[PDB]
Structure 1
C-alpha cells in the first residue's frame, strides 16, 4: 500500500547484501527446486544432431538475508533488480547455443516472499545437442535429453531437486512435432562425481518416435513400383530384344534417379541406414533382372527351350525373392 515504505524495506534488504556470497554460506547446502514449462519444441535436425527447445525455466530457493516482515504481499519485483541478487549458477550441459529473449524486455522474473523464499523465472530458447543413432532410420526412435547442472558449486554448497516431482515439467502434451511424436518424458535427479567432487544433476529426457507414413508413401512405394515394373520384361517375347533392353535399362535409370534425388533431399548423415539398405536391395534386384534377361538373350539362339524355361522360372523367382527380402527387411527393422 505504501510505495515509500516498500521501497525502504527493499533498500534495507539490499543494503549489506553481498551477491558474491551464496545464501547460507558456510552452512548446509541450499536446496533449489526447478520447474520447466516447455512452450514448444522448435525443430529437430539430424544433420546437426540437435533440437531447439523453448521453455520457461524457474528456480526456487530460500535466502535468509532476503527475509522481510511487515509486508504480507508477495513482491514480484521488476526484472532489472535481478542483477542485485545471488542466483544459482545453473546451466545446461549440452546446449550448443542458448539465449534469453529480450523483447520488449528481458524475459526474466524475480519474486520475493516474506519467509525469504525467492522464485526466479526465465524464458529460454536453447539448441540442445542430441546424438542420434540412425541405423534404423526412418524407423528410428530417438531419446533426446536436456541436462541441468551447477557450474561452480558442489553438492556440499547446493543441491538440485525437481519441484513438483513428475509434475514439475509441463507442456509436453501440447508439443506439436510435424515429423515426430513424443512418446514419454522422464525426469531424473542425481549427482555426478567429477574428480573435483560431487555436483547436482537434473535430466529431462524425451523419447521421440518418428512418423513413417510420409516415408512409406514418398520413398518406399516408388522403389517398390519400379521393382515391380522391372518384372514386365519377363512377359515379353524374346525376339523383341529392343523393347526388353529399353525397359530394363530405363527402369535402372529411374531407380538411379530416385535414389540420388532422395539422397539429395534426405539429410547428409554419412553412414548406413535402413532406407539405404532397402534402396540398394531394390537396385540389386532390378540389376539382376537385367542380367538375367541378358543371359536369356545370350543362350537364346543355341537353346531356345532352356531360355524360355529360364524366363518362366524367373517370372516366379524374382517376385518371390523380392517378397522374401521385403519380409526379412520389415521383420528386422520392426
Structure 2
C-alpha cells in the first residue's frame, strides 16, 4: 500500500500517544532503561472512508497487513521495539485509530555529578521518515499520554511522564524526519546513603584523628595506616552502590578528599615523630595540638566548599 494522498500539498499528521504500563531495569552503567507501554497512532486516510448508512458497521476493524500504517520508529533504542498490535479502528471519515503494546530497551544518557542527590530526565524519541508522495509530521494527543500509577523504578521517585508537543522536524538522508521527545522524570531516593556510605566512611576517618592524642609513633602508624586499609576495604564494599560514572561526582570528590586526609595525617604523624626524635618536643606537641582542631575544621570547611561547588 501507498500513503494516503494529500487533498492540496499538506503533510500527513500522525497523532501519537505513549501510555507507560511498566518501567524496569534502569542500568546506571549502560545508561539504559527498559520500558513496557502502549503506542497510540492516529491519522486520516480518505481511501478508508465509508458512508455508515450504506456500509454495514459504524467502525471498520482492520488487520495491519490490510491497510497503510506509518512506519514509526524510536531513535534511542538498542534494537527495534517488540510490538503487538492491540487494535486498528477506522471511523466513517477514514480516521485510523491504531494501538500497539510494545517493550523496548531505551538508551538515555545519565548525569551522576550530584549523586546521590541527582535527578534524571529519561528520553524516548519518536520518529517518522517522510515518503516520496507526501511528508509525514508527528503530533501529540495529550489525552493518550500517561502512565500507570503502579509504575516504579526502585531507588527513584517517578516525578512525571510528558511529551514536548512541538516536534523536531529536520532533514536526514535526503528526506524529512519528524521527531517527538517523550520525557520520564525521576529523582533519586538518597536516604539510605547516609547510614550506608557516608557515616561509616566518616567514622573510619575520625578514628585516624585519634593519632592527635597520642605520642606513640607505633600506635599512630597503626591508627593511620590500618584506617587507610579499612577505608579502601569499605570503598570496595560500597563500589556497587556508587554509579558507573568515569567522571568526577560529588561523592567521588568527598572520597578523593578523604584519601588526601589520610596522606596529610601520615605527614603529621611522621613530622611529630621526627621533631621529637630530633630533640624538638615543643614543636612536635604544638603541631599535634593544632591538628586536633585543624583536621576537623579544614575537613568541615572543604566539604562546604565542595557542597556549594556542586549545588
Corresponding position of 1:314: 291
What residue number does 1:95 align with?
77
In structure 1, what is the equivalent of residue 3 of structure 2?
Answer: 22
Secondary structure, counterpart of 2:203 in structure 1: helix
> Which position in structure 1 is the counterpart of 2:200?
222
> Residue 272 and residue 155 in structure 1: after superposition, are their counterparts in 2 closer, same or farther (change >3 A)?
farther
Count residues in correspondence: 304
Q: CA deviation at 1:26?
A: 7.4
Q: Would you say 1:210 and 2:195 are equivalent positions?
A: no
Q: What corresponds to 1:10 in structure 2? A: none
Match in the other structure for 2:310: 333
Alignment partners' CA distance in 1, 2:160 and 2:133? 29
State the TM-score, normalizing by the size of structure 1: 0.83
Structure 1 segment 76-225 matched on structure 2, within 5 A: 76-77=61-62, 81-100=63-82, 106-153=84-131, 156-164=134-142, 167-171=143-147, 173-188=149-164, 189-194=166-171, 196-225=174-203
In structure 2, C-alpha distance between the alignment counterparts of 1:40 and 1:190, rounded to whole Å: 25
Q: Is the 8 A contact 1:274 1:333 kept in 2?
A: yes
| Distance in 2 of aligned mates of 1:148 and 1:182 | 21
1:89–1:152: 8 Å Cα contact kept in structure 2? Answer: no
Q: Secondary structure at the match of 1:292?
A: helix
- Structure 2 match to 1:5: none
Question: Cα distance, 1:52 vs. partner?
Answer: 1.2
SS in 1 for 2:239: helix
Q: After the TM superposition, which parts of structure 1 deviate over 4 Å for at least 4 consecutive aligned residues?
A: none
1:151-193: CA deviation from partner (whole Å, max 9, x where unpaired): 24389522221123xx431116542121222334442222422
Deviations 1:74-120 (A, max 9, x none): 3445xxx212210011111111124325xxxx453212222222111
Report SS of the residue matched to 2:192. helix
- Rounded to whole Å, the distance in 1 between the matches of 2:79 and 2:243 is 21
* Structure 1 residues 325 and 197: CA distance shift in structure 2, 3 A: same
Corresponding position of 1:286:
262
3-state DSSP of counterpart to 2:156? coil
TM-score, normalised relative to structure 2:
0.88
Unaligned runs of 5+ in 1: 1-18
Q: Counterpart of 1:74?
A: 59
Contact 1:40 1:53 in 2 (8 A): yes
Q: Secondary structure, in 3 states, of the residue corresponding to 1:138?
A: coil
Aligned to 2:120, the other structure's residue is in SS state strand
CA contact (8 A) 1:155 1:198 kept: no
Cα distance, 1:331 vs. partner? Answer: 2.0
Q: Relative to total residues, which structure has the larger strand share, 1 or 2?
A: 2
Distance 2:38 2:283 in 1: 75
Contact 1:41 1:54 in 2 (8 A): yes
Deviates more, 1:279-288 or 1:134-143: 134-143
- CA offsets 1:221-255 (integer angstroms, 9 cap, x no match): 2221111111112122x1x3322221221101111
Q: Post-superposition shift, 1:263?
A: 3.1
Cα 1:277/1:154, change in 2 over 3 Å: farther
Does the 8 A contact of 2:129 with 2:136 survive in 1? no
